[PDB]
Amino acid sequence: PNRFDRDRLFSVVSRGVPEELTGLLEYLRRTSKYLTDSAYTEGSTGKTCLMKAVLNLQDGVNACILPLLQIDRDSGNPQPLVNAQCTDEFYRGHSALHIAIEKRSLWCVKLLVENGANVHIRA
User: Fold this and answer.
1) 55 with 103: CB under 8 angstroms?
2) Are 80 and 115 in contact, with CB atoms under 8 Å apart?
3) Are the beta carbons of 80 and 73 closer than 8 angstroms?
4) Where are the ANK repeats?
5) Helix/strand/coil percent split, the chain, to 5
6) Around 72, how many Cα atoms within 13 Å sit in the side-chain half-sphere?
7) CA–CA distance, 64 with 20 (Å, rounded to integer)
8) Which long-range contacts (CB under 8 A, 24 or more apart) does 112-117 make?
9) 8-state DSSP, 43
10) With contact defined as beta carbons under 8 Å apart, do 35 and 71 qualify?
11) CA torsion 112→116→120→123, rounded to 10°?
């Protein structure tokens, strides 16, 4: 079950159970891959798993938000998903903090900004 795909993680963060996230650490190091490079993001737009978790909050809460960032932090690229933005012409520059604000979620904004989220990234 170490092997992971785009749609699997998309569904996992959609459901909102954090226990199923376990196992990503081994896979992210067996292939020497990072969550931003080519791991889990839609090719058409550039939309990543974090936003997929943030586009659906069950009554304004998602447990899966809590671990995943340090899942990036321990073994991630210099960009901590704040500089990872969609490459869709209609939707360029729109980062996860923008979803967090527009979803009217103050907690997500708190977590992102205290986890190193640049604010000068114009969408």
Assistant:
1) yes
2) yes
3) yes
4) 2-44, 45-91, 92-123
5) 50, 0, 50
6) 23
7) 9
8) 112/82, 115/69, 115/73, 115/80, 116/80, 116/82, 117/80, 117/82
9) T
10) yes
11) -50
